[PDB]
Amino acid sequence: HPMTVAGPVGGSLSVQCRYEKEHRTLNKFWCRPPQILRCDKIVETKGSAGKRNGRVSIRDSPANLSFTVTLENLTEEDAGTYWCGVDTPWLRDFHDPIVEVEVSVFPAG
C-alpha cells in the first residue's frame, strides 16, 4: 500500500500501481489525498479528468493488472503524497487508495 518515487527537476518519473483482477474494468485515477472524502482527480482512465492533464498522464494495462502514471517536466511543487485509486461503477461517497505514493523531486544534479 505505501510507495515512494523520485525524479529530478525538469525530468520525468513514472509510477506503476498494481491492482486486482476485480479492478480490471474500473476507472483508474491519480490524485492528492481527499480534503474530506473524495479526492480531486488529476487524471483518470475513464472519467472527466482525462487520460492526459498537462504534464500528467495515465495509461491502464489490464493485462498486467496495473496502470502507470507519468509526471513530466517535474518541479519541486510536484513532490508530496498522492493516491493511486479506482472508482466503482456506481461510485461511492468516498475514495480509498490502492497505493499511497510519495513523490520526491530533487534538483537536477
UniProtKB/Swiss-Prot annotation:
Detail the disulphide connectivity of this chain as listed in its UniProt entry: C17-C84, C31-C39
Q: In which tissues is it expressed?
A: Present on the surface of monocytes, neutrophils, a proportion of peripheral blood T- and B-lymphocytes and lymphocytic cell lines.
Specify the glycosylation sites in chain numbering: N64, N73
Q: Which residues form a coiled coil?
A: none
Location of the Ig-like V-type domain: 1-104
Q: Which domain of life is it from?
A: Eukaryota
List the ranges whose topology is Extracellular. 1-109
Cellular compartment(s): Cell membrane
Which family does this protein fall into? Belongs to the CD300 family.
What's the name of the protein?
CMRF35-like molecule 6
- Which lineage? Eukaryota, Metazoa, Chordata, Craniata, Vertebrata
The record's gene field reads CD300C
Whole-protein coverage range: 27 to 135 of 224
